[PDB]
């Protein structure tokens, strides 16, 4: 199984980040689509969420699952997050190597105004 | 409502706890009819040293 | 005899018990390995010594997948 | 295979031993949606009853307060070395 190997690969970051009590930006990648959601320091309730599965963002792009789409999500989430009042957050890469789409999402989230 | 407690046995070869309990009830010597307010505590104190006290 | 040796005892155990108000820095448990784990506002030193990181009342919890004992503090 | 039996009122270590030192012993009836029923009964009868192999198989009707309850002997506690019963679990 792959999933389970990705969960335990993530867990250290998650458990460390819930201990500090920080608002984390979870980013689930998928072969088709990329997701993102800013979750409260308690961990249960979500404040902001956006993805390429949302038609509002899906209708604009060429294909939902690439660096240019991940930037469009990474911008979108950080556009909402500032309207809600969020600014200082952390970035939970969630067992995905900080390299392609997730880096494109992170850089877009930085460029959009979200402080981390 | 009060309860008349009486010490009916010596407190010589006794445990420090039981020696204390009598000091907490206010019993000094054998044949000392001390009356106390009836609460769940005092009944507990009496229950601790029931072997050496008598209730009226 | 063949043996007759022993080590000096280490004074390990729960120092501050559940409910007890502790100060920031106070040691809660000296132990060898993580019998108890660090929860909220509790640290864990090189010696696996759990200590308070904030002024509050010590709380012993039993949570997690493997059913482990955690020590948290709540002000 | 019919035994008269009283309902228990005291129950614990102190009561049970006092009871067993009076030619009786504690048993219990349970089964179905109804509540369990603690049952004091005579020793010398039930000692003679268990010699027969039917006792640990067939249905027994225990008489309690007039009412006859149908049961089977599920489990039983022998006294360690002396030939005598301590306790019987009657399933309904």
């Amino acid at each position: 199984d792959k999933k389970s190997a990705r969960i335990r690969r993530a867990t250290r970051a998650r458990r460390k980040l819930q201990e500090l009590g920080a608002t984390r930006l979870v980013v689930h990648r998928t072969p088709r689509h990329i997701y993102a959601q800013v979750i409260a320091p308690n961990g249960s309730e979500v404040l902001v969420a956006a993805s390429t599965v949302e038609k509002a963002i899906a209708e604009q792009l060429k294909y939902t699952g690439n660096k240019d789409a991940a930037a469009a999500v990474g911008k979108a989430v950080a556009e909402r997050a500032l309207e809600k009042g969020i600014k200082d957050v952390s970035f939970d890469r969630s067992g995905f190597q900080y390299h392609g789409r997730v880096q494109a999402l992170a850089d877009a989230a930085r460029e959009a105004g979200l402080q981390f | 409502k009060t309860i008349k407690i009486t010490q009916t046995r010596s407190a010589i070869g006794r445990l420090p706890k039981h020696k204390a309990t009598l000091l907490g009830l206010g019993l000094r010597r054998i044949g000392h009819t001390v009356e106390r307010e009836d609460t769940p505590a005092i009944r507990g104190m009496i229950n601790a040293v029931s072997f050496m006290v008598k209730v009226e | 005899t063949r043996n007759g040796r022993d080590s000096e005892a280490k004074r390990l155990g729960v120092k501050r018990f559940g409910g007890e108000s502790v100060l920031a820095g106070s040691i809660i448990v000296r132990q060898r390995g993580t019998k108890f784990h660090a929860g909220a506002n509790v640290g864990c030193g090189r010696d696996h010594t759990l200590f308070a990181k904030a002024d509050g009342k010590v709380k012993f919890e039993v949570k997690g997948p493997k059913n482990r004992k955690f020590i948290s503090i709540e002000a | 295979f019919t035994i008269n039996a009283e309902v228990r009122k005291e129950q614990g270590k102190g009561a049970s031993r006092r009871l067993r030192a009076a030619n009786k012993f504690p048993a219990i009836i349970y089964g179905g949606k109804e509540a369990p029923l603690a049952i004091e009964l005579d020793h010398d009868k039930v000692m003679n009853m268990q010699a027969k192999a039917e006792f640990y198989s067939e249905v027994l009707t225990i008489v309690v307060d007039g009412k006859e309850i149908k049961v089977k002997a599920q489990d039983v506690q022998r006294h360690p070395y002396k030939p005598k019963l301590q306790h019987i679990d009657f399933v309904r």
Binding site: - | - | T1, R2 | Q50, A53, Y56, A73, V76, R78, P80, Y81
Partner: protein, 136 residues
């Protein structure tokens, strides 16, 4: 003579033989020799009581030994002062509480069983009694 084949520890604390036994029901065989008294059975006593049974019932029948020593008893030599170590392990004993089935027997008559267990009972220090396998 029964003995553990290798152990973790050579010498063991004296302990306190208390409470009631657990091997109380007659499990394997039809008949059994239950220990009424309390005490301890040496390896020698068990073998001596086994030989006395086995010889009484002849080649026929089947016998179990529910007890096993697994407790080493030390003893200090003669003309030796106290201390200067724990003594040396001399014999092996099984602690027997009341209720313990010691021996079990099967494939013989009730008449010839009881007489076989008497001869064993005469070799043992503990007061014993006959017990039959009751169905539940």
């Amino acid at each position: 003579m029964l003995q553990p084949k290798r152990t973790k520890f050579r010498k063991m604390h004296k302990g306190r033989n208390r409470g009631l036994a657990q091997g109380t029901d007659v499990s394997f065989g039809s008949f059994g020799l239950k220990a009424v008294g309390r005490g301890r059975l040496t390896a020698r006593q068990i073998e001596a009581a086994r030989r006395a049974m086995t010889r009484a019932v002849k080649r026929q029948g089947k016998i179990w030994i529910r007890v096993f020593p697994d407790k080493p008893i030390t003893e200090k030599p003669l003309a030796v002062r106290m201390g200067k170590g724990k003594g040396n392990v001399e014999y092996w004993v099984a602690l027997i509480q009341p209720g313990k089935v010691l021996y079990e027997m099967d494939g013989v008559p009730e008449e010839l069983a009881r007489e076989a267990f008497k001869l064993a009972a005469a070799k043992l220090p503990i007061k014993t009694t006959f017990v039959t396998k009751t169905v539940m």
